[PDB]
Enzyme design. Structure first.
Site, PDB file in Angstrom:
ATOM      1  CG  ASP A  60     -46.097 -86.051  36.648  1.00  0.00           C
ATOM      2  OD1 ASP A  60     -44.703 -86.265  37.171  1.00  0.00           O
ATOM      3  OD2 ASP A  60     -47.117 -85.941  37.722  1.00  0.00           O
ATOM      4  CD  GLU A 120     -45.101 -89.860  37.014  1.00  0.00           C
ATOM      5  OE1 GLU A 120     -46.318 -89.424  37.288  1.00  0.00           O
ATOM      6  OE2 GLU A 120     -44.169 -89.399  37.953  1.00  0.00           O
ATOM      7  CD  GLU A 136     -40.601 -88.514  34.614  1.00  0.00           C
ATOM      8  OE1 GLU A 136     -41.474 -88.658  35.530  1.00  0.00           O
ATOM      9  OE2 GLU A 136     -39.235 -88.458  34.840  1.00  0.00           O
ATOM     10  CG  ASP A 161     -38.066 -90.913  36.743  1.00  0.00           C
ATOM     11  OD1 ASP A 161     -38.126 -89.627  36.619  1.00  0.00           O
ATOM     12  OD2 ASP A 161     -37.156 -91.380  37.691  1.00  0.00           O
TER      13      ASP A 161
END
Lengths: 238, 239
Positions: free
Chosen positions: A129, A56, A132, A60
């Protein structure tokens, strides 16, 4: 980490259902593993089961570059304050959870029993989450070009909506709710024609209620045109 | 945008000096253009002169992915909290300006006369911004692999210092100042040895004053070992 039988099944189903195959299936398993499940399994002695938190973290950054690149290339005349506004909106939990749901991502998450019992599979934050983390897994497994291959068209659409200040949400679901409430029947989508403008093939869909055309939407795929048509009809009906 | 003679010379020099040759020189030019220069030129009728602000917007994302990928691949055991802390420091204005200065970027920037007069060529923010803009330009012109080829080693070094909690700054310049003050002579860096230790080659540098070794430093390149030796010597010389 050695996938047990139920984990391997989920990992196999995810690839078959989403069409996103993986070379290293361990990266995919990890992206789908919520920390509640990693902690549960570790406490049961399976120390190699790890959460998607690190993916994650990388994901991002993958997402930010992917969205900023689309903005930079598609909106050369936009003021920088606008690129930033759209960037934040496009990469928000809200958009990502929407994308995750459309992919039925919740079906494939690994959650601890308590998290499962308390609604975690429907939690916007957990879905966003995991999405990502998935981007990082795909990035690591197959590269940035694969990410564009799978998601650029879809995100170009969301970014266009946001740049134009058009509210972004699950158009088809919203339209159905409002049409059933007022007419007791569902909306019908009809592909009425296709075009080849700008270079891309374009699908033209009319959304109708009781045979009457409410709105016409256009898109680069049948799905996209249907979404556009629902957006226009929703805004019009309201 | 047609590059005039002075813009053309700067662009040619940048490529020759840094060795980073562009297929599309307009990308390089734009990265080097501060808003003060673009506005000055626009007001004088050259409407196609654009600032580096959009490239910087993209460049910031390129930088974030570059640093995060290194953090993810090199520190698998680090807690995510450490990764986020190191990320912020590694992509900070302070670090980016340091990097820009190492590339002598300040000499290639296009600035408006007023901005130049107020010290803009030495401004940390202007330098950091142009560097992020440059990363975007290189990313668009040559790709992500070129960015790693050019900066990975350097950033892995900074990231390691920050990850270890060791302060990061221009060690050499800082040591030079303290040694010159106390001894009236500058420190000297001597590569005393090179060796291949299960990875690649590693240089061992000793920094000395008047022939006496103050500290020894190791690195994947000679310059890296020298920076390490200076860092160690400096921390030591606060005895």
């Amino acid at each position: 980490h050695h996938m047990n039988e139920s984990e391997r099944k989920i990992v196999e189903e995810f690839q078959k259902e989403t069409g996103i195959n993986f070379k290293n299936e361990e990266l995919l398993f990890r992206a789908l593993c919520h920390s509640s499940y990693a902690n549960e399994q570790n406490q049961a002695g399976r120390k190699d089961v790890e959460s998607n938190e690190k993916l994650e973290f990388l994901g991002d950054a993958v997402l930010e570059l992917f969205v900023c690149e689309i903005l930079y290339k598609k909106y050369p005349e936009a003021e920088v304050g606008d690129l930033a506004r759209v960037k934040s909106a496009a990469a928000s939990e809200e958009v990502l959870a929407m994308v995750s749901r459309k992919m039925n991502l919740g079906k494939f998450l690994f959650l601890g029993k308590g998290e499962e019992k308390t609604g975690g599979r429907d939690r916007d934050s957990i879905l966003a989450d995991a999405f990502e983390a998935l981007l990082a897994a795909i990035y690591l497994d197959q590269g940035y070009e694969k990410i564009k291959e799978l998601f650029e068209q879809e995100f170009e659409f969301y970014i266009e909506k946001i740049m134009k200040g058009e509210m972004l949400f699950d158009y088809k679901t919203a339209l159905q709710e409002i049409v059933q409430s007022e007419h007791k029947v569902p909306p019908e989508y009809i592909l009425v024609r296709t075009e080849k403008n700008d270079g891309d093939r374009i699908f033209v869909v009319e959304v109708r209620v009781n045979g009457k055309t409410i709105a016409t939407g256009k898109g680069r795929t049948k799905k996209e045109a249907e979404k556009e048509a629902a957006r226009i009809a929703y805004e019009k009906l309201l």
